[PDB]
Design a protein around this ligand. Structure first.
Ligand SMILES: Nc1nc2c(ncn2[C@@H]2O[C@H](COP(=O)(O)OP(=O)(O)OP(=O)(O)O)[C@@H](O)[C@H]2O)c(=O)[nH]1
Ligand SMILES: [Mg+2]
Length: 218
């Protein structure tokens, strides 16, 4: 039925501090995509942290079940091959790995190296670009089997067309049956999402659909 719910959620990082989230409400059905938008400091990553149990509500209720795969907004690499970085301790399957690689446009990068998927990262040899590290980090999160994918601004350092292509091939097509929360501000992502939550300084600036928002326009 419903995969993730927040109801009247208020939370604080620090006792007696200012609330980081204020009366937040949303629901995601199984297989849907929630886009979470808002300016820096609005509370988007903190919302993800609450779903992951790192931040408890002071008011309100939260529902979520099952395993989570989390993609940080800060890309990271550990010493090892590009294949090891993407599978990252999960069991290996050639078809699944290849599908993720292709959806993240990493096939083109990998094909250029003599060592192919065995190119070694994070050990002083290859220095990856920001966009390469972001696509590897996204691929790692998408390769993991999970009930809920939390993708925190995963398109760092990508030009707008590459971002659009990967949003479509990875988030929309490859992950079509999966419950997804994507922190993103881009118009097409909000338009393709089943629901949109725009945060501003902890509060719900807007919650609904892109179509509902368009209907409010003069
Ligand atoms: N005390 C404390 N404050 C935090 C922590 N993490 C985030 N914050 C603060 O909580 C507010 C929201 O922060 P975030 O949730 O990281 O904001 P965001 O929407 O993810 O911002 P961007 O990632 O820059 O787009 C901010 O005012 C932060 O200063 C923490 O671990 N401890
Ligand atoms: Mg953040």
């Amino acid at each position: 039925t419903t995969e993730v719910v927040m109801e009247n959620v208020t939370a604080f990082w620090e006792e007696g501090g200012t609330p980081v989230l204020k009366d937040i409400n949303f629901k995601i059905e199984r297989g849907q995509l929630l886009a979470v938008a808002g300016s820096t400091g609005a509370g988007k990553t903190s919302l993800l942290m609450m779903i992951m149990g790192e931040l408890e509500p002071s008011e309100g209720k939260i529902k979520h079940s099952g395993r989570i795969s989390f993609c940080s907004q800060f890309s990271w690499i550990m010493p090892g091959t590009i294949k090891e970085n993407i599978i990252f301790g999960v069991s290996y399957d050639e078809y699944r790995y290849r599908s993720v690689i292709k959806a993240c446009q990493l096939e083109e990068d990998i094909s250029k190296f003599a060592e192919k998927d065995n190119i070694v990262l994070g050990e002083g040899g290859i220095t990856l670009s920001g966009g390469q590290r972001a696509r590897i980090s996204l691929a790692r999160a998408v390769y993991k089997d999970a009930d809920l994918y939390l993708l925190d601004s995963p398109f760092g350092y990508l030009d707008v067309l590459t971002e659009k292509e990967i949003f479509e091939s990875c988030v929309c097509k490859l992950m079509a049956n999966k419950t997804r929360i994507l922190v993103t501000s881009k118009m097409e992502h909000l338009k393709k999402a089943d629901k949109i939550l725009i945060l501003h300084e902890g509060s719900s600036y807007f919650y609904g659909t892109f179509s509902e928002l368009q209907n409010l326009q003069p």
